[PDB]
Amino acid sequence: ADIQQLEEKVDESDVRIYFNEKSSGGKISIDNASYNARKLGLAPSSIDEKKIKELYGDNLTYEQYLEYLSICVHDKDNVEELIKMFAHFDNNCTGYLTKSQMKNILTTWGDALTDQEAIDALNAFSSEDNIDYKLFCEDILQ
């Protein structure tokens, strides 16, 4: 993570405008900071949120928000690692998991999605029930 690197990757004008959209008393909540990060095309995890919250609390100044954004960049993100995570659950090595299987994975471990969140994401990705998880991982990284 690095602030200079962040500011070459995303437009600081957007960073500022999004902060102003959500700020109260010159500070932004972690949840709204994560929303903004997502609008900027970044993907914070719960570990990122907890890092910044434990340093600065629930509401971030503009600079603290920039720091939090820098943590969200995740330049080491790698599609192969994501695919191999799903491949682990692919008991028959078919390249497919059903929507129900995917839902169970996504709602049971890690930074669990709600049932509705997982269902909606899977239906948004595919009309068909069998999900090619390689294609799914490639899609979410974009």
């Binding site: 929303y35 997502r38 994501l82 996504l106 890690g110 930074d111 999605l113």
Partner: peptide, 18 residues
């Protein structure tokens, strides 16, 4: 099994949702 990678998957899903 591969928890950090699952967390990255979930993070990108939340990003896509927004």
């Amino acid at each position: 099994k591969n928890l950090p990678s699952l967390l990255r998957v979930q993070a990108h899903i939340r990003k896509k949702m927004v």
